[PDB]
């Protein structure tokens, strides 16, 4: 397929900054969600899930079409719990009905990161809502009960190399696992809603014990009370991945830079941007705007 980015007719930067501002202000206000963690993490996951169904081989899936809106994609068992991110964005959508769904879901991901003190992620508008029929079948999102090899291979379908996968994985410093959603339970770290290189440090410095949970799945549990999925732990089992985790554990800055690039790339997979398209936008945070 060929998915060409088409700007929302008549809209510019300022129009988008306003959508961002609305998502941001609503993140600030609804902070009771999930025991005071807020919706930041779920939105990050939301943007990654809508973009992870991409397949470099035939161009299907990816964020373009906003297919997550259709039943089949919405009801994907791997997307269990995402419904909450979606409800959070509905009123936003009703307030700016001109934005395409794929642009809104991805933007929310960008806003969450930034408002959570993460790096600035350049973003581009242009996604266009496609028909129900372009909805990818379930099964394209990864399983968490595997190893590094699995990880490597899987990521390959999205065009990501070792550095890219390690980077992207640091998102697992945010939020937690929920038994009813995935069969996993427990916060990944301590900050939970502040974006840092925590993930890497936790991986190198905790005393993890392999245990089974009430869902009967194995998970790595730490004495401080955190958790790591088998796929997460495999990052320290692979020699190539391990040196990357060390780098990140040593330089938040480098991580932020790498994550940023990678994040954008992830959200743009499958999209063709015409030569006249506006450059990517860099939104100001509520803080930078004094709001
Ligand atoms: C092999 C790769 C991955 C696997 C198998 C995976 C699996 C999981 C699992 C099973 C959950 C818990 C969901 C719940 O029960 O509510 C989760 C949570 C999370 N995922 Fe990942 N994940 C991976 C990749 C990613 C990446 C690439 C991103 C973004 C860059 C990310 C962002 C997060 C976030 C922020 C949450 C926490 C959500 C919340 O607090 O509701 N994950 N992931």
Element (H, E) at 212: strand 208-212
Pocket flag, ligand 1, residue 235 (CB < 6 Å):
no
Residue 44 CB less than 6 A away from ligand 1: yes
**Residue 178, ligand 1, Cβ within 6 A:** yes
3-state secondary structure of 41: helix
Q: Which atom of ligand 1 is nearest to the CA of 81?
A: 16
Q: Which helix (H) or strand (E) holds 279?
A: none
Cβ neighbours of residue 279 closer than 8 Å, sequence gap 6 or more: none
Q: What angle do CA 244, 114, 124 make, to 5 degrees?
A: 90
CA distance 252 to 60: 34
Mutate which of 177, 179, 193 for ligand 1 pocket (most atoms within 8 A of beta carbon) = 177
Å from CA of 152 to ligand 1 middle = 16
Q: Is the CB of 193 under 6 A from ligand 1?
A: no
Interacting residues of 253 by C-beta distance below 8 A, sequence separation 6+? none
- Does 195 contact ligand 1 (Cβ within 6 A)? no
What is the distance in A from the centroid of ligand 1 to the CA of 282? 25
Q: Report yes or no: 77 and 180 within 8 Å, Cβ to Cβ.
A: no
Burial class (CB in 10 A: 0-12, 13-18, 19+), 229: buried
Question: Is there a contact between 277 and 126 (Cβ–Cβ < 8 Å)?
Answer: yes
Q: Is 249 helix (H, G, I), strand (E, B) or coil?
A: helix
Mind spelling out the 3-state secondary structure of the chain? CCEECCCCCCCCHHHHHHHHHHHHHHHHHCCCHHHHCCCHHHHHHHHHHHHCCCCCCCCCCCCCCCHHHCHHHHCCHHHCCCHHHHHHHHHHHHHCCCCCHHHHHHHHHHHHHHHCCCCCCCECCCCCCCCHHHCCCCCCCCCCCCCHHHHHHHHHCCCCCHHHHHHHHHHHHECEECHHHHCCCEECCCCECCCCCHHHHHHHHCCEEEEECCCCCEEEEECCCCEECHHHHHHHHCHHHHHHHHHHHHCHHHHHHHHHHHHHHHHHCCEECCCCCCCCECCCCHHHHCC
Per-position DSSP letters for 115-144, written without gaps between them: HTT-----B--------GGGPPPS--SPPS
Place of tokens 């999205």: 158
- CA angle at 40 for the pair 169 and 98, rounded to the nearest 5°: 110
Nearest CA to ligand 1 atom 4: 144
Rounded to the nearest angstrom, the distance between the alpha carbon of 131 and the centre of ligand 1 is 27
Ligand 1 site-directed mutation target among 106, 143, 163, 171, most atoms within 8 Å of CB: 171
Measured from the CA of 170, which atom of ligand 1 is nearest? 30
Which atom of ligand 1 approaches the CA of 182 most closely?
15
Which residues make beta-bridge pairs with 177? Answer: 186
Smallest Cα–Cα separation from 230: which of 139, 165, 140, 150? 150
40-51 vs 252-268: helix crossing angle, rounded to 10: 50
- From the number of C-beta atoms within 10 Å of its C-beta (0-12, 13-18, 19+), residue 248 rates as buried
List, in order of start, the domains of the chain with CATH numbers. 1-141+263-291 (1.10.520.10), 142-262 (1.10.420.10)
Which technique was the structure solved with, according to the deposited record? X-ray
27 lines ligand 1 (CB under 6 A): no
How far is the centre of ligand 1, averaged over its atoms, from the C-alpha of 46 (Å)? 9
Could you identify the atom of ligand 1 that is nearest to the CA of residue 263? 30
Q: Which atom of ligand 1 is nearest to the CA of 141?
A: 5
């Amino acid at each position: 397929l060929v998915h060409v980015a088409s700007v929302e007719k008549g809209r510019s930067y300022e129009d988008f900054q306003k959508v961002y501002n609305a998502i941001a202000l609503k993140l600030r206000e609804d902070d009771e969600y999930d025991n005071y963690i807020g919706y930041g993490p779920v939105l990050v996951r939301l943007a990654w899930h809508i973009s992870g169904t991409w397949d470099k081989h035939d161009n299907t899936g990816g964020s373009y079409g906003g297919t997550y809106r259709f039943k089949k994609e919405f009801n994907d068992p791997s997307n269990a719990g995402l419904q909450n991110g979606f409800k959070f964005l509905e009123p936003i959508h009703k307030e700016f009905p001109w934005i395409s769904s794929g642009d809104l879901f991805s933007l929310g991901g960008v806003t969450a990161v930034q408002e959570m003190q993460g790096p600035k992620i350049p973003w581009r508008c242009g996604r266009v809502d496609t028909p129900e029929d372009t909805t990818p079948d379930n099964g394209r999102l990864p399983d968490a009960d595997k190893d590094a090899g699995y990880v490597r291979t899987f990521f390959q379908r999205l065009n990501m190399n070792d550095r890219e996968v390690v980077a992207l994985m640091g998102a697992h410093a945010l939020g937690k696992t929920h038994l009813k959603n995935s069969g996993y339970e427990g916060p990944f770290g301590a900050a939970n809603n502040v974006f840092t290189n925590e993930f890497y440090l936790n991986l190198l410095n905790e005393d993890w014990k392999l245990e089974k949970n009430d869902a009967n799945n194995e998970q790595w549990d730490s004495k401080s009370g955190y958790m790591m999925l088998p796929t997460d732990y495999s990052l320290i089992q692979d020699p190539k991945y391990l040196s990357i985790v060390k780098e990140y554990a040593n330089d938040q800055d480098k991580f932020f830079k790498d994550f940023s690039k990678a994040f954008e790339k992830l959200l743009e997979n499958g999209i063709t941007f015409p030569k006249d398209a506006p450059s990517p936008f860099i939104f100001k945070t509520l803080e930078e705007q004094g709001l």
